[PDB]
Design a protein around this nucleic acid. Structure first.
Lengths: 864, 58, 53, 126, 827
RNA sequence: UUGGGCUCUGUGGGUGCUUGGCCGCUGGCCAGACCUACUUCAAAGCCACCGGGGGUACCUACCGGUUG
């Protein structure tokens, strides 16, 4: 795998898959909603918003194909054996795995229906049903349906349980048949035949709130709702289109809702995989229709990139509220109010993400120091033409930056009930985004309501203005944004040439936006007033410095001295900020086409993505190309400085992410994913990358191992008189342990100097006195060559010639001369050692005193 | 009145000395009864200079 | 928090029990050494201090 | 709902008001235009904020100055102080805050008496 | 230029449990936001990188002392890596955490919530697993049980980590497992009188000790009680107790500042003494059993106590009131700070302790300053007095005061410290004393308001007064004409700071605007309007919004840096504001506090707080307290500046004074929640100087080992600016070739080299090597340094710092040794 | 752009880092179940916020008692 980075969580993502959610009731006060990430699950509360409770770990090997949240455990099934990947049925609790489940050896089919009832866990793959006993997680049997024409054995309605029907399971085939199976003993006990034999594939089936009745739901259109022990039809409806049958069907168990005022039960809900519109049925007399939520979720649009559709309807049981989950990465929930009687609800909650891949990423800069700053706010501009400000610290505090009352214009136009559609009613898709908040004043920036994208200044200059300037796909307008207000800003800017915007920058003083056309010119728009202030050039040559083709990168020196521009057609160009004239250019004309640009302030480093698949790094004041990194086989999709200024991380077109060191100037790491990564962004701590991969509608976050452990790799792959080391607070306490003891009051080991004097090596003893605590060192330091004093003076003389601890030599010697002066003043066996010690002490002392007298007196002179 | 002055010093228009006082129980001593006036960007003070027809937006 | 030398010992009249006298230089100079002129000058100096104080 | 700024200026006794509003370039001093007030030899001192700041800063505003008191010289200093404070104040409240700071830098790098009037007290020497 | 966060300093302790390392030599002390460790056997402190949202409630540690779990109030959890000081996991218990005990086997930890007892598996870390990273939700939970009745004050494990035991707040203790034993039923330790503050095991796990709040300590056997025994105490209740089971001893700290110390197989008093006048909050006890640690939460009052050699190894305290000033010694190694507590105390930058506390003022100390010399600490206070402290003898020369009684709020001493200026609010003249005489030299005129910032020039020719007559003033004293020169300003002058070359001065004025003035020809050169740059918005008791409060939109204090390029500026707000002088641009801005038991932190304070009475953090809940001195509100109505009463819930966020370090790369904020040092971080961020394509560490070491050209390798390694490479080539070239390199070395890398060899002199064990470097550099580069002398004035003074902490630290010892041995050899 | 604008009101999310609803909680329940047991040993003391001056008959507190 990878060397530096490691998968943490894929963020920006609630419900992509056609694997439906699962509801469970917690107690009497919350329900819990479990969706599939892909190769993870997530649970959400109801009452606490749709806030995230868990996200399932470990990431399962394949993608998840089924789910069911029984009593406290969340069961998951994953893997398509027909195409490669391993299958499995893992069993989770509290977000972590607590069991597996033994699949049969004879199994080759992806597994679609997990269903727990009785004492049984029952899963339905594609043409067989494997049933485990749930009290011991132990495999019981495998039910094989009959076959007539090699299509009738297929099991597409799923399987289901009735409440009061004992050990039985009801399956819906690709023929019209629904079969009744005693799953405890395996036998096909009864089979029931469709009404209207022209309509003959069971697409969806559901129990009723009445006993012994089902809503079985055929591909030709009819909903049939039946007794299943009289085998007699109770109602027949024509709900599906032949081009668009019912795929979701869900009764309400509230006990009211029907009868044109709302006092009787019998409210049905249905939806279809072909449309994002849910249809409600009064069920009493003959079951009239009563209304339809049109574009509850997005429609599956031919020749559009968004991924609408629906996946599941569920009435939250016993309650007036109904969760529906689309395929457009959105789970929403709707409420039948009772004060008027609307047969079409309003939203109570909604959570959603990108219904399309993510095209640009940006981590928002530091809330100036700390206070949830540096890293928490991602900012993704996707291909569903909308920003999102994602949050790392909690997923429930994430939302779109709004471009207006767009669903008001979409329902107010005919554009929601089936010119353009809703994503086409938003802005274009976003090429790049540039932010600098020091003029983001919080929630209240301009505290009224302002016109969006217009094409005051006392209240601006006291409270804030727009944060994020943004360049879009094919428009000449750099549109601006308020970060703290989560809102489209009151400005949009043209370029000067009229050609669409190529690259947009904002100065880090937060006042100037600075836009760059694909035709060459550069404009500068003050964000407070929203006014054109400087053109590059103004009106070397003073007026002539103009670019040719698209300015693919521009960034400002953060002291507002120079702005550096960077076109594709040739060269990089050095502009004066306060004048607009042109100072110096670095010229790479006959070779290069710089497609992208990054900047590190405080390091003054600008990294260029030359179209030779290279990254040429230049220092903005040195103006010499400090490096280049040749490592890419596809073109550079994205590239980004690490916040330290050490690393460059480039996601290439060949689906390899690489990372080069800047001091070492070598590839530290390089690794290969499953998909080409389109977008990259670091944090401003070093803790996270994010990457948007071509195909998934979320980004994924990589933690950084070079913080949390020592990853040591540097592999260029392809595929005199010295002191001691003892603290001054260890020997100066030896010097002054007369008074440190006094202000602190309220109101073989002795043979080491002997053996070390037997040998001519005292370094074991010196290796003790360098390592004893100072009370024990003043304690332990406190005839005929078995004395300790001559061994000590000889030891410090040996250390004075060996030159290894000078401060400890003078330290031990001065405490020795203070507390052993009597026996050495009277005794005579050691005054040779004080003579020789005095001589060598006079040598090293006189030399060192000449040194520091010159240094102290002449440095302390040169200061005057 | 004391109700109007109390409301003004809980909305924070006053200062005693250099600090914007927002406590209605702030005991004022005899020489600090000279260094008490309106705070810097005060709408009340613009109403006073505006009444007196001598304001200045500078 | 220790003490200055001029607060440990400073030479003065209370510190000298002499026929000499500790001067303002800090140095004891004895009267028996002192001639007519120097005892005369110390009389006129101390009387200068009386006419000031 | 108009873009109006009132501004004063001072000297010894000459006080001058100037109202600066959203206009089209004119400066009128006591009804008569600015190039007609203050007898000829001091109109350069009238013009000093204009040809520091550039007329392009002034082509969107109207400055109306009333001057009272003082002699001729003190009325000139009161006028030019009212001009400079008028445009700094209008750019304070209506156009962006950066341009105010740039105008204050130009006027202060020339002479601070265009913005802050320093009246003379006396010196009772010690 | 690029300042990150160095140590918090100036508070040893705040609310919270404190802990030892298992080595016994590190003390883990919670300050408000953060945790400071200080290395105690070799005194050197450090604060962690993280910062909680509220005050620290608790800290736990792994037995292998590598993993630290801190808790802020309402259960806001962290766990960080102490050997590599990085922050690792975030977590949130949902209740507030009132007990926390990490397992002795490093495997589980029990947390005691407000009644809940949840035992959790400790997360495996990337230091533990082989090829492993951060997981997502790493904390898994082993059990939870809520079969208690009230709060759970304490949690104590076994020694073998199979039982743990809970000290209630109701009345009882409870003994509990981790897995089901076969002869064990989980059971309840019966009635005390008030409620148990501890319940500790022995080594032999038969008798269980339990320590209540009303003094009583019981011994239980198998399950009845073998002997209950109280002890007397007059007017106090038992509020903490720690029990070392290996050495069989129980400490017990009380409400009246006293702790008792009892050897307990049988009840037997070792010792007892009193350390505070206020209650003892937290007791921890060393793994050895030899050091006891006591935290008294009302004042600062952290102390460590050797229980057999009865002695304070530590007794430290912060400020219990707001600070008012800090400065640095001209060495740069100690910062002094004064407060409204009355004390002026002297803090060491390293080691994180106060080296002196001067208590000879009363009633709040306003100002604080040094001379050029760094010997004398001139300070000023509302007592009415300027005390001139002798800092080598730790006692004051001379306390000056005014003839009529004043209360001085501002203070400035001449650089050749023989002239004192002070200034007050009561009078509005400015008083000048003479140090080498002792009298009052003058009082000076001119101002129509209380002079509110005084500053002498670092030349010492010009005094500058800034007063509430919206004016400043050049006071030219020292010549024969004691003349003035006023500076008519726009608003009330808040501050005055000098350029370290005396040619330019900056004033803060009450608009929020800074302006810059020539001093020789008095004339404004520049100015910032910083009103929007400083707005740390919406304290509580603001019914106005965050960006409309005038009162957080002005700078109290400004300084220049030692180069003379950037200014610090700061006010009654949350942002410290770092400007420049030549281009006037805001360079950098720092959020002081992330805290939320402070007040002025969140601009846009959220509406979940505002109940139908008002802010929920404004309801006086002091009657919700079980202790009498907690319940009694002995405050005075309407007191802003220092009162003994001090309800003091949610203090605001000010900076009370910033100052630059005299050596480079550091930064001080005297804020409310401590004394923050910011430092120019240099060990992570790559930053070259003028670098080419070839220049790698393989190229520097290539011309170091293959073809040894020491000048090209030295300028090469400078030219990368990497400390490992400049250390490698520095300790690679020889002391014969030093004079060759410096004799032919480029002139424009010289002060970088002077700062480097100054740091290597003060830190590396290479005396004669580095002193040969300094000798060669000043010998060759003499006329350059003397000619410039202001461009290099910080580089010459970090060197003079190094060659005088060498001249005084070891040559007193060399002289005393050579003349001592000369005597003993003379006999 | 096949209507627009002000104002007011409501609901949901957000305005601090994401570990479940409830209980008699190492277990159980979310459709509840069982309901009334079991018992050898009352308690250790101290402390505990009324504004200033003043009165003291009766009550109360405390101190010293007095018989019966």
């Amino acid at each position: 795998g990878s060397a530096i980075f490691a998968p943490y969580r894929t963020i920006g993502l609630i419900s992509p898959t056609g694997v439906p959610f699962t509801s469970i009731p917690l107690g009497k006060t919350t329900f819990q909603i479990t969706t599939s990430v892909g190769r993870a699950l997530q649970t959400y509360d109801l009452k606490r918003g749709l806030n995230l409770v868990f996200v399932t770990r470990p990431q399962t090997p394949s993608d998840i194909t089924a789910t069911h949240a029984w009593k406290e455990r969340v069961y998951a099934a994953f893997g398509d054996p027909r195409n490669g990947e391993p299958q499995g049925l893992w069993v989770f609790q509290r977000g972590k795995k607590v069991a597996e489940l033994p699949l049969p050896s004879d199994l080759d089919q992806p597994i679609k229906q997990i269903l727990i009832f009785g004492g049984w866990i029952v899963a339905c793959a594609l043409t067989r049903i494997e049933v485990w006993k749930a009290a011991t997680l132990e495999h019981y049997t495998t039910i094989f349906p009959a076959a007539s024409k090699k299509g009738d054995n297929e099991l597409t309605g799923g399987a289901i349980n009735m409440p009061t029907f004992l050990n039985k399971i009801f399956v819906g085939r690709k023929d019209g048949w629904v079969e009744i199976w005693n799953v405890s003993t395996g036998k096909l006990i009864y089979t029931l035949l469709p009404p209207s034999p022209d309509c003959g594939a069971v697409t969806c089936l559901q129990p009723t709130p009445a006993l012994s009745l089902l809503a079985i739901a055929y591909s030709g259109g009819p909903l049939v709702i039946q007794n299943v022990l009289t085998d007699k039809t109770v109602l027949l409806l024509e709900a599906g289109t032949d081009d668009a049958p019912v795929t979701s069907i869900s009764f309400r168990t509230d006990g009211l809702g029907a009868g044109q005022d709302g006092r009787k039960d019998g409210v049905m809900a249905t939806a279809t995989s072909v449309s994002g519109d849910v249809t409600f049925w009064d069920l009493n007399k003959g079951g009239r229709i009563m209304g339809v939520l049109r574009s509850a979720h997005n429609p599956p649009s031919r020749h559009n990139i968004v991924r609408g559709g629906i996946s599941k309807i569920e009435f939250l049981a016993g309650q007036p509220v109904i969760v529906t989950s689309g395929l457009d990465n959105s789970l929403k929930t709707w409420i039948f109010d009772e004060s008027p009687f609307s047969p079409v609800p309003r939203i109570l909650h909604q959570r959603s993400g990108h219904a399309a891949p993510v095209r640009c990423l940006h981590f928002l800069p530091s809330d100036f120091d700390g206070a949830e700053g540096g890293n928490k706010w991602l900012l993704s501009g996707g291909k569903d033409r909308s920003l999102w400000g994602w949050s790392l610290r909690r997923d429930g505090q994430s939302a779109e930056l709004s471009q207006g009352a767009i669903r008001k214009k979409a329902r107010k136009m005919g554009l929601l009930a089936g010119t353009t559609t809703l994503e086409d009613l938003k802005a274009p898709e976003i090429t790049c985004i540039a932010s600098s908040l020091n003029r983001d004043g919080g929630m209240g920036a301009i505290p009224g309501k302002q016109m969006i994208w217009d094409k005051n200044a006392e209240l601006s200059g006291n409270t804030g203005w727009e944060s994020v300037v943004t360049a879009h796909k094919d428009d000449p307008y750099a549109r601006t944004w308020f970060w703290g207000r989560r809102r489209a800003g009151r400005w949009a800017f043209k370029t000067g040439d009229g050609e669409p915007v190529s690259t947009v920058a904002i100065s880090s003083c937060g006042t100037f936006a600075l836009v760059g056309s694909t035709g060459g010119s550069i404009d500068m728009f003050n964000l407070q007033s929203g006014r054109h202030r400087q053109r590059f050039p103004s009106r070397f040559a003073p007026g002539t410095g103009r670019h040719t083709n698209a300015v693919t990168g521009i960034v400002v020196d953060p002291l507002n001295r120079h702005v550096v521009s960077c076109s594709l057609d040739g060269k990089v160009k050095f502009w004066d900020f306060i004048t607009g004239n042109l100072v110096d250019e670095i010229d790479w004309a006959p070779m290069t086409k710089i497609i992208g640009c990054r900047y590190h302030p405080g390091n003054d480093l600008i990294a260029f993505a030359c179209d030779d698949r290279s990254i040429r790094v230049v220092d903005i004041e040195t103006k010499n190309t400090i490096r280049e990194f040749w490592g890419c086989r596809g073109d550079i999709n994205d590239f980004c400085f690490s916040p330290d200024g050490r690393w460059i991380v480039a996601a290439s077109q060949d689906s390899i992410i690489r990372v080069w060191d800047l001091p070492t100037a070598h590839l530290i790491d390089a690794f290969r994913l499953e998909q080409p990564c389109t977008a990259l962004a670091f944090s401003h701590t070093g803790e996270y990358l994010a990457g948007a991969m071509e195909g998934s509608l979320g980004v994924q976050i990589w933690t950084n191992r070079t913080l949390f452990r020592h990853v040591p790799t540097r592999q260029i792959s392809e595929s005199m008189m010295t002191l001691s080391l003892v603290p001054r607070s260890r020997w100066q306490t030896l010097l002054h342990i007369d008074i440190i003891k006094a202000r602190n009051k309220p109101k073989t080991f002795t043979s080491k100097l002997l053996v070390g004097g037997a040998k001519g090596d005292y370094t074991d003893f010196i290796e003790h006195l360098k390592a004893l605590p100072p009370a024990a060192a003043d304690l332990e330091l406190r005839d005929e060559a078995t004395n300790e004093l001559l061994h000590f003076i000889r030891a410090l003389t040996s250390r004075l010639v060996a030159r290894r601890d000078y401060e400890l030599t003078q330290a031990w010697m001065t405490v020795f001369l203070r507390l052993h002066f009597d026996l050495i003043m009277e005794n005579e066996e050691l005054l040779q050692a004080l003579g020789e010690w005095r001589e060598h002490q006079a040598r090293e002392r006189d030399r060192l005193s000449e040194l520091v007298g010159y240094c102290g007196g002449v440095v302390s002179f040169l200061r005057s | 009145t004391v109700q109007a002055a109390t409301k003004l010093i809980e909305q924070g228009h006053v200062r005693v000395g250099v600090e914007e006082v927002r406590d209605p129980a702030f005991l004022v001593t005899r020489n600090m009864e000279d260094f008490v006036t309106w705070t810097v960007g005060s709408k009340i003070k613009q109403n006073i200079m505006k009444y007196r027809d001598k304001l200045d937006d500078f | 928090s220790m003490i200055a030398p001029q607060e440990v010992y400073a030479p003065s009249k209370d510190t000298a029990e002499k026929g000499e006298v500790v001067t303002k230089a800090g140095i004891p100079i004895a009267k028996q050494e002192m001639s007519r002129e120097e005892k005369l000058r110390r009389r006129r100096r101390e009387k200068e201090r009386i006419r000031k104080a | 709902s108009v873009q109006a700024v009132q501004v004063f200026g001072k000297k010894k006794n000459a006080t001058a008001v100037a109202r600066c509003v959203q206009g089209k370039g004119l400066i009128k001093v006591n009804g008569k235009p600015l190039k007609l007030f203050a007898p000829e030899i001091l109109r350069a001192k009238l013009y000093e904020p204009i040809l520091i700041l550039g007329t392009d800063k002034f082509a969107d505003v109207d400055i109306r100055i009333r001057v009272a008191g003082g002699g001729h010289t003190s009325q000139v200093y009161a006028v030019r102080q009212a001009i400079a404070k008028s445009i700094v104040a209008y750019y304070a409240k209506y156009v962006d805050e950066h341009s105010k700071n740039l105008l204050k830098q130009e006027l202060i790098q020339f002479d601070r008496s265009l913005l802050v009037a320093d009246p003379r007290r006396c010196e009772p020497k010690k | 230029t690029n300042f990150k966060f160095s140590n918090l300093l100036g508070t040893v302790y705040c609310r919270g449990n404190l802990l030892f390392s298992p080595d016994g030599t590190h003390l883990f002390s919670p300050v408000g936001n953060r945790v400071t460790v200080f290395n105690l056997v070799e005194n050197k402190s450090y604060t962690f990188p993280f910062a909680h949202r509220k005050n620290i409630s608790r800290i736990g540690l792994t037995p292998q002392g590598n993993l630290l779990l801190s808790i802020d109030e309402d259960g806001q959890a962290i766990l960080t890596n102490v050997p590599r000081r990085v922050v690792l996991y975030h977590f949130s218990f949902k209740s507030p955490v009132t007990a926390l005990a990490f397992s002795p086997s490093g495997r589980h930890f029990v947390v005691g919530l407000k009644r809940k007892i949840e035992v959790w598996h400790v997360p495996s870390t990337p230091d533990t697993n082989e090829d492993g990273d951060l997981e997502f939700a790493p904390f898994v939970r082993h059990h939870t049980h809520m079969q208690h009745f009230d709060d759970v004050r304490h949690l104590e494990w076994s020694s073998d980590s199979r039982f743990f035991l809970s000290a209630s707040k109701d009345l009882t203790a409870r003994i509990w497992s981790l897995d089901t034993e076969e002869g064990f039923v989980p059971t309840v330790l019966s009635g005390h009188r008030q409620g148990v503050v501890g319940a500790y095991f022995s080594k032999d796990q038969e008798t269980i000790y339990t320590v209540s709040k009303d003094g009583a300590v019981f011994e239980w056997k198998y399950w009845r009680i073998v002997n209950k025994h109280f002890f007397m105490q007059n007017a106090a209740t038992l509020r903490c107790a720690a029990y070392h089971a290996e050495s069989n001893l129980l400490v017990a700290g009380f409400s009246n500042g006293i702790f008792g110390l009892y050897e307990m197989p049988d009840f037997n008093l070792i010792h007892t003494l009193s350390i505070s006048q206020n209650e003892i909050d937290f007791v921890t006890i060393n793994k050895s059993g030899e050091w006891l640690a006591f935290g008294a939460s009302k004042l600062g009052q952290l102390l460590v106590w050797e229980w057999q050699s009865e002695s304070y190894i530590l007794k430290q305290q912060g400020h219990f009131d707001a600070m008012n000033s800090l400065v640095y010694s001209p060495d740069g190694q100690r910062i002094v700070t004064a407060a409204d507590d009355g004390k002026i105390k002297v803090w060491d930058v390293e080691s994180g302790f106060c080296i002196v506390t001067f208590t000879e003022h009363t009633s709040g100390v306003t100002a604080c300053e040094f001379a050029k010399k760094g010997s004398v600490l001139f300070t000023a206070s509302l007592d009415g007095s300027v005390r001139a402290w002798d800092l080598i003898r730790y006692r004051n020369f001379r306390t000056f005061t005014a003839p009529e009684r004043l209360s001085f709020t501002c203070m400035a001493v001449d650089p050749s410290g023989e002239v004192i200026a002070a200034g007050s609010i009561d009078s509005f003249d400015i008083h000048i004393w003479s140090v080498q005489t002792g009298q009052l030299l003058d009082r000076l005129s001119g101002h129509e308001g209380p002079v509110s910032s005084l500053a002498f020039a670092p030349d010492g020719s010009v005094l500058v007064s800034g007063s509430w007559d919206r004016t400043a003033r050049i006071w030219s004293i020292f010549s024969r004409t004691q003349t003035s020169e006023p500076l008519q300003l726009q608003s009330d002058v808040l501050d005055v700071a000098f350029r370290p070359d005396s040619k330019q001065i900056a004033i803060s004025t009450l608009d929020g605007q800074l302006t810059f003035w020539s001093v020789s020809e008095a004339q404004q050169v520049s100015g910032v309007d910083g009103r929007r740059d400083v707005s740390g918005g919406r304290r509580i008791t603001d019914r106005r919004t965050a960006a409309n409060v005038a009162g957080t939109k002005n700078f109290n204090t400004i300084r220049y840096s030692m180069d003379g390029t950037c200014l610090l500026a700061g006010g009654n707000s949350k942002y410290i504001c770092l400007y420049s002088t030549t281009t006037m641009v805001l360079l950098k801005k720092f959020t002081v506090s992330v805290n939320l038991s402070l007040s002025g932190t969140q601009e846009f304070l959220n509406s979940k707080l505002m109940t139908e009475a008002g802010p929920v953090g404004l309801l006086d809940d002091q009657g919700e307290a079980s202790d009498l001195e907690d319940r009694i509100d002995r405050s005075l109505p309407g007191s802003k500046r220092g009162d003994p009463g001090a309800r003091k819930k949610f203090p605001e966020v000010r900076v009370s004074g910033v100052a630059f370090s005299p050596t480079g790369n550091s930064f001080c904020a005297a804020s409310t929640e401590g004394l923050l040092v910011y430092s120019l971080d240099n060990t992570v961020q790559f930053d070259p100087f003028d670098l080419n394509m070839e220049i790698t560490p393989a190229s520097t070491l290539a011309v170091l080992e293959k073809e040894k050209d020491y000048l090209k390798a030295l300028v090469m390694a400078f030219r990368l600016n990497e400390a490992g490479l400049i250390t490698r080539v520095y300790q690679a070239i020889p002391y014969t070739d030093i004079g060759l390199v410096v004799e032919q070395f480029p002139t424009v890398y010289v002060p970088r080299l002077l700062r480097f060899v100054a740091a290597q002199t003060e830190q590396s064990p290479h005396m004669e090597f580095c002193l040969l470097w300094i000798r060669a550099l000043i010998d060759k580069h003499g006329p350059w340094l003397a000619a410039n002398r202001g461009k290099v004035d910080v580089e010459l003074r970090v060197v003079a710092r190094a060659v005088a902490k060498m001249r005084d630290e070891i040559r007193r010892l060399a002289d005393e040794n050579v003349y001592m041995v000369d005597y003993l050899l003379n006999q």
